[PDB]
Design a protein around this ligand. Structure first.
Ligand SMILES: Nc1nc2ccn(CCCCc3ccc(C(=O)N[C@@H](CCC(=O)N[C@@H](CCC(=O)O)C(=O)O)C(=O)O)c(F)c3)c2c(=O)[nH]1
Ligand SMILES: Nc1nc2ccn(CCCCc3ccc(C(=O)N[C@@H](CCC(=O)N[C@@H](CCC(=O)O)C(=O)O)C(=O)O)c(F)c3)c2c(=O)[nH]1
Ligand SMILES: Cc1ncc(COP(=O)(O)O)c(CNCC(=O)O)c1O
Ligand SMILES: Cc1ncc(COP(=O)(O)O)c(CNCC(=O)O)c1O
Ligand SMILES: Cc1ncc(COP(=O)(O)O)c(CNCC(=O)O)c1O
Ligand SMILES: Cc1ncc(COP(=O)(O)O)c(CNCC(=O)O)c1O
Lengths: 454, 454, 454, 454
């Protein structure tokens, strides 16, 4: 035994499963807005010997030894994190140690707020994330709502946009100490300036979760939340096209009233919440971050917008509804209830063809288990050199998939009856197999970032 | 740009900086009990395309689609984890989604305890970790102490802990979960004693197997999986996998008067998602499944069986030459010196000679800035096929470093001037480089798991 | 020494002070809405040997002895508490042990809600009480807002009434577990049915604080909050005209879904919060409670309404503003800003004449230390056999007092300058002395409940 | 109806039922260490017209008007309280507004501690009270344990507490305030030991003088007012006043390196109002001011000096006839029997003979439903001018009751049949009424403080 053996030789069972996923990604139309395809250069850094380095602490302020050059990669990851978002190293710091996006948000709360302090974020069915404080009417399900007292703000159901007026009214009576300005399912750009004015009135910190749109912010193709918010969090595996980690950006220097964000946030990530940093992920983020400073990444993010706008205008002419009218970023929200189908049936219909999407509730729904919409993303296929005409054909396969699920809903009743009919009825099982072949052949022709084997 | 370019061509920086890490892992003898050198097969799954998949949920119940492959990779890792520790699938279940060891422990707290409820663990300055409930008496450091009221447990004479002063403070603090785990402790823990002492106070037994994880899977050191109810661990230490976490929870059933099932697996799986974290790191789940398959092989048990006799030979070689073991022996994998002359003084002279360790507070130390004890680790170099006479030489290499350090401790002034004249004086850098030379020549000759370049 | 000596003989210093207060109450026009004049029969029961009886527990469920006949007075106090409000002894229980109104509300919260649970009450400047959860924009000042998370609902500034629509909107997003339906400064009757509909939608307990209006509810001259709310609290020293204590009324029996209010509320008062019950106060409340069942008390409460309505219509013809238009209960809220004077100056002007009132903020004020209104009560003087024509003359003295403070504000600037000018300037000091004599001579002619000496 | 009618004419019920209470207080010998017979002068101020005044606020800063008299009555009570315990007004302040002893203690917790912060007091089954932080290990009883995490302190051999096991659990629980008070304990508390043990753990010393309040004012028992920082007490026990509470807090200043004032009096006065309670009970504040004026007289010290030698004669008379004192003596005012034969069995046979006591858990009792110890009290009958030979007779009266109880304990079946055959069997009611007869004839002959009728 030496540990240098091959995965294909040491574990052919796992190498087979790990090889069956790559072809599914090659043959599938990934429309999930949160998913991308990480480059090869960042993946071989994520699966490297940096997994074998304990660097608890921070560069210079390490508690153990052996972090000679590991400190240099964390400083490199910090220096290009600010460079990718055009930040002064004297006015903005960055913490690269968050394991993912969810631990990144929890670190901001523990650093700035006391337990049971008041949190305001967009409600989950309206487009907010779990970590922005979410509670059902039955019990608290997000830990942000267990350790802190959260209260959500809703959309304007007429326009589908965030009700900034209702947020101003609600914050004046709830008196939050931190308001989250970030989205998981929202086609337009958040008015971060209006957010800042509401925060300054009730004396609250403005946290901007840049997770879905950070790649567009890095390319400067959409307004940057750094110009109004003073605490920015983001994942690095969505539009950033890197490994699964998290970044926390904070103001630094003087606000002389000093900005006291640098010391508490770094203390919340370690030693409060996390322990050993995933240095293999840090270097993978830094590889993707320097890719974000290149003119290629701006051309990539510019294409993600027009690709989402292309499918958005493509779905409209087919007779589809889009909440908030259309789209200004990377994801479109299709409203399926005007056509007689719901997101639950459509998500299962499109998945059996390898068009991976996700259900999403629409303003006005009262069903939970049967949402009337889907969230379709662009940056996944756009990294595969997809362009406008390619996304127009993606929607053509969507419609022919929706049209299938429409006639199946006429032959079936409950949702449990629906998923059993798509696999039993060979007349529909063959009709689904035809679009599957016609979708997988259209998808394999496009290049795929990363390794060609695994 | 396609995303398939090599790291050496795309980021010529990050390529060199990582090759300096693998060089350091080969140039030096790593002896931090928590560190290890993972196998090449597992890291290929760590740098996989599974980094791209969003699989929020669990096998069976998932909120997305296109998860056909990752579902079987997760169920494979759960079955490989249950087999690696010889657990009946009907009596035990495992969640394989925690990002690391620290998040795995916080998930068990959120699941079984309400906010500000009471836990008990051995103190960090007494051989514990931050995630067990450590507060600095002037500040609440870890989030284990901010969201849950923890009482630190600590006997300095026996070298062991005070396993009945814990029972003394048990009924007077009345905890709901006591932690039986170690971060810097050389002896075993009476797992039959920790259980009944939790039953008389109506508490839950939590075993944090993070350091002993390998010595338990190989059935060479007694296991907690029939005395404890919930078990958390790292896939990092002694298991030689990627950096992630595991939560071993009981499952199943007897109320003979007037049926009594376990209530664990629905709450801890809800704590991991959607409470604490979001999208699982499938590349980490697949990587640790490779290490778990290796853990069921006799090649891993003989590797484990070597670690104990390597640590025993490590302590005896130090015992035979004027060094006190803070236990009277060690069946674990680490040592505990009483450096009869301090702790923080040895690390600087070691890491400059390409040998890294960490400070350790010995029972009786009145300080924390200049402690008196080093914790050296066997699993790291044992994975490089180190054996008895190979480790006996390692204790002789530290000998010349500690013996030169005792000469610098006789000079200079406080800890600041210790590290000052080392990288400044001309004559002192002679024994620095000579001992580093022979240490590098002795280390590079051993095989190194993982890739050859990165 | 024997302890049977007279207060006039044992302590002539305290007997002098205690005698100077009674004449101030005899000579003064008490317009504070929360104040009344307790009868002699209830006062000599409040200052009796029942002070010398430890009866911790409840009748029958006593922990010590000696409560032979003390148990009978608590059952008598309970039986007439329900009788005074026309409650079925099988559908309503009552706890008479609360020391006062503030401990009564805190007992309801601790019995029904967990720490940091969500509370909704009327904001303090809008007419709510402290114990209904009040927080400034700077810090939490009420213990209800420290142990529980409170959020206030506001008035409709156009109509001066509670904004039930905004409360329905706010409760749907705040998700409270208890909503308070009670007032301290509100001239109209709360729509308790609308309150109940909002509580049943967000699944919250409806607590009605009957403190100011319980005498009107006992006489059945205003709608009873018992017909919609299931938890009712009240003081017994306002319109109840008894000692200073508190009552908690709760549903009992079946809601078979049982009502689980009786056991938890009785446990929160004792042993959770309070200790030894003030049995002298319990019997004093029972004396006043049986007075509330008499036809005299209904004629008294009927007069309190028309006396408040008389002064309300009297103030209107003098050119005064009343928020919410007028009055439907016992207290009128005068808005003084249309006349150029504020409640701070008027309260000090009327106090120096022995017309005791209190400042009160008005909808739209932004001054705190200079409120633009006053809260004038009726049940205090109405118990002195005051009638409509008498209250019309009370307002005549008010106007001539306001007219004084109007011309003083022209000769002065800051509020600290104002209170120093009313005592220095002998030209105004004599003008105030004239209305003082003309007010005290009008007040002494009316009878005064209680002892004629102390 | 005018409100000036006597209680005997208005409520002929309540008149008779109270005269049965004074009859019972005269017919029987009260020996509950907490009970007392208040003076006639204080109760005249308790049944005063000050019950009618709303004086929310403090002398100087009040939110109302017409408080000229009650302001001086409050400042008089503060000065009489500082003098009664010999405190410099510049070094000590007192708040006289707590409704009772339990609210006074909760106010000190809210003022100096944040929610869920940590306190330490002696356990209720070990001689404590609920307000010191008692939880039933299966439920959190007192609100001291619901809003603050309390650890109960407890040595059964010495009879005393374990005054260094408290130090054993001190640094391991790290409280912010330890309580030095007693509800059922016969010895004194080392006040110099409680202070330094709180200083090494950075805690506050709270002395709850509720039972020893009289023995401290008379300067016959050592005082905590130069070792402790905050002191709470009842005006009820040994002080022979109305039922209320007092909060003695330090005030004033020394930072010789690089001025250091006390930070107590602004927070505890804010905790009493407007945090916890609202309107003060001015009739109680005036009543206790009368008892405080009596406490500064030599007639009260010789009364106090009698209580100790009465309790010492009470214990020695019991010691001389086969009874064990749970201390080895008593300098307090209470006893502690080991009833060598139970506790709950004696109270029923006593209160039926017109002598009342209470259960007391002796160190070593495995039960709580049938404890083994009675706590008899001296201050009650000492106030009736009881002396040595008078109390020596009281121990001889209980003798025949306990000796008949040992015969019933030899019969019947469990505690249920003990009290069953007492009020049912014909022959058993003979020694019942005979011993009650001579006990009533012996009790009615002594003078009784307070009024003659009520
Ligand atoms: N934007 C957004 N997308 C996505 C996609 C994946 N993620 C991350 C993973 C999230 C997983 C998840 C989601 C929901 C619940 C949940 O608990 N759901 C409620 C009903 C919700 C609802 O929508 N209720 C009403 C609303 C009011 C109305 O309009 O009536 C309805 O629409 O019916 C319930 O099942 O109890 C849950 F437990 C776990 C997100 C995200 O965080 N954010
Ligand atoms: N109804 C009502 N009457 C009465 C009368 C007596 N009691 C019981 C005793 C209460 C004592 C008390 C009252 C207020 C504060 C307080 O803290 N007050 C704020 C500013 C308040 C305000 O009104 N702020 C704004 C409102 C928003 C706007 O309209 O702008 C303004 O009006 O300016 C501050 O001083 O900080 C306090 F500490 C203590 C009550 C009661 O509870 N209820
Ligand atoms: C705002 C936001 N924050 C965090 C996350 C996820 O954090 P992790 O990287 O820890 O999973 C998401 C993705 N949420 C799922 C989706 O949008 O599809 C998100 O939209
Ligand atoms: C006993 C124990 N448990 C859990 C963890 C958490 O592991 P992560 O850092 O991967 O979250 C650690 C960290 N171990 C630090 C050390 O001994 O060097 C640990 O020592
Ligand atoms: C609704 C309410 N609750 C409680 C209280 C007072 O509780 P205490 O009896 O414990 O003080 C008041 C009187 N608040 C003052 C006023 O209205 O003038 C009140 O209006
Ligand atoms: C030591 C102590 N402190 C405070 C209190 C509270 O007093 P109130 O019940 O007046 O709030 C008590 C009650 N004493 C009960 C007894 O010993 O009989 C007590 O014993």
């Amino acid at each position: 035994w030496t540990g240098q053996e091959s995965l294909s030789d040491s574990d052919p069972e796992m190498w087979e499963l790990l090889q069956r996923e790559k072809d599914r990604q090659c043959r599938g139309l990934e429309l999930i807005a949160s998913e991308n395809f990480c480059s090869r250069a960042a993946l071989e850094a994520l699966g490297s010997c940096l997994n074998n380095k304990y660097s608890e602490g921070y560069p210079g302020k390490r508690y153990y030894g052996g972090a000679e050059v590991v400190d240099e990669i964390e400083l490199l990851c910090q220096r290009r994190a600010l460079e990718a978002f055009d930040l002064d190293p004297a006015q903005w710091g960055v913490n690269v140690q968050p394991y993912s996006g969810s631990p990144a948000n929890l670190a901001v709360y523990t650093a700035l707020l006391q337990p049971h302090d008041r949190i305001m974020g967009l409600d989950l069915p309206d487009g907010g994330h779990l970590t922005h404080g979410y509670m059902s009417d039955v019990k608290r399900i997000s830990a942000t709502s267990i350790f802190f007292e959260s209260m959500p703000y809703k959309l304007n159901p007429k326009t589908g946009l965030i009700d900034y007026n209702q947020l101003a009214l609600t914050a004046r009576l709830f008196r939050p100490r931190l308001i989250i300005a970030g989205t998981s399912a929202y086609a337009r750009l958040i008015d971060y300036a209006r957010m800042r004015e509401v925060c300054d009135e009730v004396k609250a910190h403005l946290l901007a979760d840049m997770a879905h749109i950070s790649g567009l912010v890095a390319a400067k193709v959409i307004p940057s939340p750094f110009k109004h918010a003073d605490i920015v969090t983001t994942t690095t595996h969505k539009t950033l096209r890197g490994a699964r980690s998290g970044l926390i950006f904070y103001r630094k220097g003087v606000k002389e009233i000093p900005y006291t964000f640098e010391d508490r946030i770094n203390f919340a990530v370690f030693p409060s919440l996390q322990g050993g940093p995933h240095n293999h992920a840090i270097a993978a983020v830094a590889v993707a971050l320097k890719q974000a400073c290149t003119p290629m990444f701006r051309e990539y993010s510019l294409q993600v917008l027009k690709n989402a706008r292309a499918m958005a205008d493509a779905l409209l002419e087919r007779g589809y509804s889009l909440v908030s009218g259309g789209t200004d970023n990377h994801l479109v929200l299709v409203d399926l209830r005007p056509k007689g189908l719901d997101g639950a049936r459509a998500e299962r219909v499109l998945e059996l063809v390898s068009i991976t999407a996700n259900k999403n509730t629409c303003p006005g729904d009262r069903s939970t288990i049967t949402p009337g919409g889907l969230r379709l993303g662009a940056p996944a296929l756009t990294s595969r050199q997809f362009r406008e005409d390619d996304f127009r054909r993606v929607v053509d396969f969507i419609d022919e998939g929706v049209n299938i699920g429409l006639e199946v809903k006429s032959k079936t009743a409950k949702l449990q009856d629906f998923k059993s009919f798509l696999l039993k009825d060979s007349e529909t099982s063959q009709r689904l197999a035809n679009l599957r072949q016609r979708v997988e052949q259209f998808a394999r022709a496009f290049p795929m970032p990363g390794f060609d084997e695994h």
